[PDB]
């Protein structure tokens, strides 16, 4: 039977970035294969320069996005070179059984596996590192992503009609909880394994020191800002693999969210906030209405403008006077 | 366009009381306007006597609740008096661009400014003040409310029928962060600017020293229960800026809910308890069928009971053994 | 009225196991009789032997599932031995009037009282002791359990269909609140009494010291993991009466969930993880489509695998390639 299913191999990008896909399929079931390389690597996550030892899928945190439709086959290798230090493995929430896969998954450096599983739900789902005692500090290290199981008839509304994104960006948020000396000041190591018995114990304070999008304060703004224009319908997949996030577009609303990321359910309309639980990926679709720059955060505003929960979106075009104007400027009474 | 619209200016009312509006539109779209004057204000929120500098909209935590129709225009005409020490603005979720309107109205004391939106979606929505780069300050600091945007032809059930209220009340929780001493005594300070440093300090750690309902422990108690009668349809509406809440009213139910509070979405029913998100105003419909009094409370039973997040009814009628009786009062064995 | 209805009287059992009933109702509505006996007792929490003075509905924590149908009467008897310390009381989330019934079921050390109720919402719902100013310290100290309220004609999908559960377990999640000396090292003391000032305080940190299912740390693995087969449809009931919870099966899915566990709503299908907030009972439909190990986990990783919010399903049966395989075991490059 699979033996005559077609194959495709696809080269992932990095987050936000998404590869290419259809949104409809025009093809019958294939097996879609992938390729992940795990990479151990310090990471400076803040302007005063903390440093971490990042644990990653591919080299970035969050890990890329995975893009299949209802009923294909993935088809994974994994592969963990002997420069690592760590075993590590993989658990899809997509997937059904032994753990997500992560019983079949385990490779010490210098080891790789191929893992194949049937994609038979449709909607967004997170996937993470989860080896045996040490999950927390792994999916805490930055070790998760997501991949988006897409209906093979693509997205639909409230109602069974169609919608189609122009644009899609992935936003992995993550919760980093950096050991602390007496004063506050924050530790630095020099390998994974020496951090591990003081991460512990700044783990279950339950409270992270950084929450961050795409693995730093700042790491999508400025330059590194989201962009669309007026008129453009946009996809957000967002994610968080340990905590719950509540993410609102200053300015704009979830017109269609899926909070829970499942696509057999019906979206929920014009949302102006809307809760991601920790341990899964959520996905909004807005049309932008208006130009100028949009700030993308997670609503606890301690966590977005303390934190580092906060990104932006630049987009181009028109302003409408009719949606909003100012009357009379700020002046002197 | 706008020029030939009717206009009606409003005089709002403080929590947890709300304006006088119709369900239903009687009229065709309107420009609808506002006045709000901020007052930077020392508040005592518990028994004990701690102070703090709030920072509000027209003097109450939470700021006034304005309630118009899907497309009417909101003009708010929004005032910082040169008795004010600090910059303020203002970013209405319920709007598109501009940050909600946060680039547009920024004033400084002795200044003024009006701001014109379409409200184009209906639902309840937070309003909140967001300077740039002092955003989590002012708004724990109890500047933030909610506004309504009921749809031309009022509320509706999971099946299309009208929902008619009796009464509305707006609850506004709200967390505050207070320093404190080595001891744990909390600090005062004279002027907004002094408590600054140490107010950021206070928020980092993410664990709220007080949760109030309408701006103080045991506002909504005693001589100011909310109240109702057995057979009184009730709409609670409720709103939490930052932090998440799970509301529950103690003897009752929430028959139908909107718990992200938007109305093109059906709402749920009989619900025991509803999470509302960090950023988000809610609202619940419940028919009053047993009179006594009822506990409205954050249900994390510590935030209720130890930090302040409790209020009550009191309800007048005729109690039902149908529904609950005592069959054997309280005796020893 | 009452008088001419049947009567049943039914012996309930110890989490996670549940009473037997019927999904649908073979009868006509019924007085269903229940007698509860509250426990003051100490129990150990964790593996090193933390010891606690738990207050209990029953001896057990979680207090033990109630299953009834859509308007039956539920009629408890509940004692409070001269042996137990405290004045205990019971608020069912399920009834409507006089605090959920805690206004009326006070009872000190040597008294009874019987409470009777007509459960008109279906769907599973929260109970829990709330004695006046010591709500969230019988609360914290496991004193709550759940009713569940079956529609008379059983469950239903998304589209009216009936759904039949093989299996039925119960999970109640705990969130404990341990004092602990300058060194971290958890206090224990003679009384329930003698830990209450130091109780209060370690509540106010907001940060649970352990969080477990049935409990204890590992109290639902090993010898204790749940059981299924391929094939079986199972339901697992959760609750978590002062604290948000994000359940997940690893290795499987909630194929119809009702997170706020009211069944008059249609379930959300295909979830990998839900939001169950404190002060609520949800329910989980799951058919088992492969064998082995799989961890029933609070998603929020740190809470599960460092604080106890973990358990086990053992299942029974076939493997299926077609869903997973290891194209490739763990080998050397
Ligand atoms: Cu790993
Ligand atoms: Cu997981
Ligand atoms: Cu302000
Ligand atoms: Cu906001
Ligand atoms: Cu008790
Ligand atoms: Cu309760």
Redesign the interface.
Known sequence: ?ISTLPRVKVDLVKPPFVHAHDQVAKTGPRVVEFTMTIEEKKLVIDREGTEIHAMTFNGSVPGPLMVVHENDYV?L?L?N??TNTLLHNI?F????????????????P?????????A????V??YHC?PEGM??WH??SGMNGAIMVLPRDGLKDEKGQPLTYDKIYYVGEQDFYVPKDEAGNYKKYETPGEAYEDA?KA?????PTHIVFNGAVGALTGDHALTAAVGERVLVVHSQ????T?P?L????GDYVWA???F??PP????????I?????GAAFYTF??P????YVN?????????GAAGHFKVTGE??D????????????
Chains 1, 2, 3 share one sequence.
């Open positions: 039977d088809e290798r592969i070179p002997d658990d929430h997509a997937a059904t059984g032994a753990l997500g896969g992560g019983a079949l998954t385990q490779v010490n210098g080891e790789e596996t191929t893992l194949r599983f049937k038979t739900k449709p909607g789902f997170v989860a999950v927390p999916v805490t512990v783990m279950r304070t339950l409270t693999a340990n905590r719950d509540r609102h200053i300015g704009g609303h829970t990321g499942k057999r359910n929920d309309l014009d949302q102006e906030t809307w809760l639980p920790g341990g899964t990926a209405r208006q100028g720059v949009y700030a609503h606890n505003l301690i966590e977005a403008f303390e934190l302003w409408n009719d949606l909003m104007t100012s009357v009379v400027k700020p002046a002197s009474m």
